[PDB]
Amino acid sequence: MGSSHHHHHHSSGLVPRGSAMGLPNNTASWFTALTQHGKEELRFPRGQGVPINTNSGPDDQIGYYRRATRRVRGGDGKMKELSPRWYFYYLGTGPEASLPYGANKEGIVWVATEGALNTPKDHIGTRNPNNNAATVLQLPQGTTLPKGFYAEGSRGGS
């Protein structure tokens, strides 16, 4: 004490203890999710498949969407059940780029750009409450939605 103060090192608990993280360190969701209400699953039409994106893949605009199902306790003990939606998961090389690139699944919809070249560029998908909101995808002119699907959302008004 007095002069030269060291970090928070009481020197009582040797054990590291990461406050039981088990959650996204600093990544919430730097993007939106296509809410599917129809009777089908996500699967953007031909042409591109994946939104315009921002910088989650220079020459490797590939990836997939993970069907996210959130629940909300409406009223006093009610269940509204948040509108089902799939969150975008950019993919290329710089970032994870570990997956098999097209690992077909049940609640997962894979999609690759018109010929992924594979390039370095990782620095997204981390909407840490302090950095910035989510760029939220924006399908090009076409790339419409399947049977009865609702675009990412894009809340009109930040």
Side-chain angles (χ1 to χ4, degrees), residues 14-146:
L14 152 148
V15 64
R17 169 134 238 168
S19 310
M21 256 119 227
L23 294 138
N25 184 29
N26 274 329
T27 146
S29 266
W30 186 270
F31 240 39
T32 9
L34 207 91
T35 97
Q36 160 268 346
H37 279 276
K39 313 219 138 208
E40 313 273 0
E41 269 135 58
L42 189 159
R43 240 279 234 188
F44 293 84
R46 282 266 228 282
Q48 325 215 336
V50 21
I52 272 176
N53 302 19
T54 137
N55 271 329
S56 341
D59 304 81
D60 42 15
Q61 285 202 19
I62 58 179
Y64 72 80
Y65 315 78
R66 225 271 233 188
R67 179 166 125 172
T69 74
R70 293 236 146 161
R71 283 264 230 280
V72 300
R73 189 111 92 197
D76 309 353
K78 226 61 155 177
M79 277 265 54
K80 334 189 342 188
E81 186 168 335
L82 220 60
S83 294
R85 37 190 202 195
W86 315 51
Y87 279 100
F88 190 41
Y89 180 72
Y90 63 71
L91 283 185
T93 83
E96 244 70 41
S98 204
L99 265 62
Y101 175 47
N104 209 9
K105 236 130 141 102
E106 227 166 80
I108 304 227
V109 168
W110 276 96
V111 29
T113 173
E114 267 196 71
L117 186 82
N118 320 342
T119 37
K121 243 236 163 89
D122 124 72
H123 40 242
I124 34 264
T126 157
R127 193 189 115 200
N128 166 17
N130 250 9
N131 243 90
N132 253 13
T135 288
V136 283
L137 37 135
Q138 30 184 35
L139 295 174
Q141 244 159 328
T143 321
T144 355
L145 337 185

